[PDB]
Amino acid sequence: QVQLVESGGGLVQAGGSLRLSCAASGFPVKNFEMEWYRKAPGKEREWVAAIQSGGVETYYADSVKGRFTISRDNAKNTVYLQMNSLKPEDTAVYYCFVYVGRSYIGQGTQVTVS
Amino acid sequence: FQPTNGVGYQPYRVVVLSFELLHAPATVCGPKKSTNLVKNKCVNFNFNG
Amino acid sequence: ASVYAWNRKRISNCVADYSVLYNSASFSTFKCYGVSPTKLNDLCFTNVYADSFVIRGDEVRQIAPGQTGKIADYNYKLPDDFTGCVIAWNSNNLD
Amino acid sequence: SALGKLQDVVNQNAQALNTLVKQLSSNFGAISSVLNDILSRLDPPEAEV
Amino acid sequence: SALGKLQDVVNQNAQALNTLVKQLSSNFGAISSVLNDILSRLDPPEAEV
């Protein structure tokens, strides 16, 4: 019933920009909290972002506060996040994450900064 | 696509039975099996509905 | 502790005044189930089994009987006839 | 067993009173069978049901 | 019609039994009259109600 479909990744260099997507099925995004996670190669899975269920307040981890912009699209049922000022530390597989009854994991998309 | 091509060069015929999750009614599935019946025995039965 | 190996710390053979813990304003939630917190100073128990764990901000709703969620259904389940208090406060300045 | 039709009246009223009193060791769908453990740490708009 | 004084007893007993059969299909103000729909769609400790 619930599936998260990641896209929008790619290969950029240092100082690049990108626009990811997380296509979602089975739930409106107005009712639950969504999150973004990433997993670098050789590193464990780390949290990236969140938008709350009211749609007002967003958060980020300490490496990614202020540089990225996460947004929701309500009619599309897809949650994006904007990449700007891409350091090579952001080389990871990016997973969008949601708690709708059971918490569910997408297969992710690849962003390489080099 | 020549007849003296190899199995890597000759076409593997691909069909994609796509699956998505959108607000649409279910139309095409796979089949449903059904076992044999015995008679003169207290058994639970499940007919079509 | 984290909640896959959440710590049960049972307390025994002492006197606890829950009016001080009731009147502390550093806590946010005071949801309780058995018999009144204004008479928690008035009764007399046999065993405590106090807990200590750290969760998200959204799993405050999960600390109730028969909830949904992978903590509630898979990791840390409360009984349907759960009897006791939960006390909680935000720890953004600690964790 | 000569006086059974006098005995069964007293035995039935004793079994009725025994059945009447034994109803008060039952939970009746609440959490407890004693009043305060049902009511009072629970919120009084939702314990009166 | 001479034998109505025996027929009314059997008719009243079948009437009483066939009344009590018809409250098997009574919702009584719940969500569902079938307990399978009770267990299937809605959550266990509020299926208590």
- The strand pair at A3-7 and A16-25 is best described as antiparallel
- Nearest chain D alpha carbon to C30: D41
Q: Does A101 touch chain C (CB under 8 A)?
A: yes
Residue showing tokens 């049922």: A77
Residue showing tokens 């949650």: A79
Task: For chain A, give every domain's residue range.
Answer: 3-113
How far is C-alpha E25 from the chain's CA centre?
5
Residues C68, A101: C-beta atoms closer than 8 Å: yes
Distance CA D39, CA E12 (A): 45
C window 55-84, beta carbon within 8 A of A: 58, 68-70, 73
User: What CATH number has the domain spanning A3-113?
Assistant: 2.60.40.10
Residues D31, C81: C-beta atoms closer than 8 Å: yes
Using left for φ > 0, alpha for ψ between -120 and 50, and beta otherwise, residue A63 falls in alpha
Subunits in contact with chain C (3 or more CB pairs closer than 8 Å): A, D, E
Question: Under DSSP, is residue D38 helix (H, G, I), strand (E, B) or coil?
Answer: helix
Q: Which residues contact A3 (CB under 8 A, 6 or more apart)?
A: A24, A25, A26, A104, A106, B21
**Which stretch of DSSP H or E encloses residue D9?**
helix D4-21
Distance CA D28, CA D10 (A): 29
Question: Two tokens at A34?
Answer: 């969504």
Residue showing tokens 């919702």: E27
Amino acid found at A3: Q
| Contact list, A25 vs chain B (CB under 8 Å) | 20-22
Length in residues, chain C: 95
Looking from the CA of D16 toward its CB, the CA atoms found within 13 Å total 6
Looking from the CA of D9 toward its CB, the CA atoms found within 13 Å total 3
Q: How many CB atoms lie within 10 A of CB C84?
A: 15
Which residue numbers come right before each break in chain B (C to N over 2.5 Å)? Answer: none
Residues A1, B22: C-beta atoms closer than 8 Å: no
Question: Under DSSP, is residue A17 helix (H, G, I), strand (E, B) or coil?
Answer: strand
Q: Nearest CA to CA, how far is A15 from chain B (Å)?
A: 36
| Contact list, A33 vs chain C (CB under 8 Å) | 58
Distance CA B23, CA C64 (A): 33
Experimental approach was: cryo-EM
Distance CA D21, CA C29 (A): 41
Resolution in A: 4.0
Number of H helices, E strands in chain A: 0, 11
Q: Nearest CA to CA, how far is B20 from chain A (Å)?
A: 9
- The strand pair at A11-12 and A109-113 is best described as parallel
Nearest to A20 by CA among A107, A105, A94, A112: A94
Amino acid found at D24: L
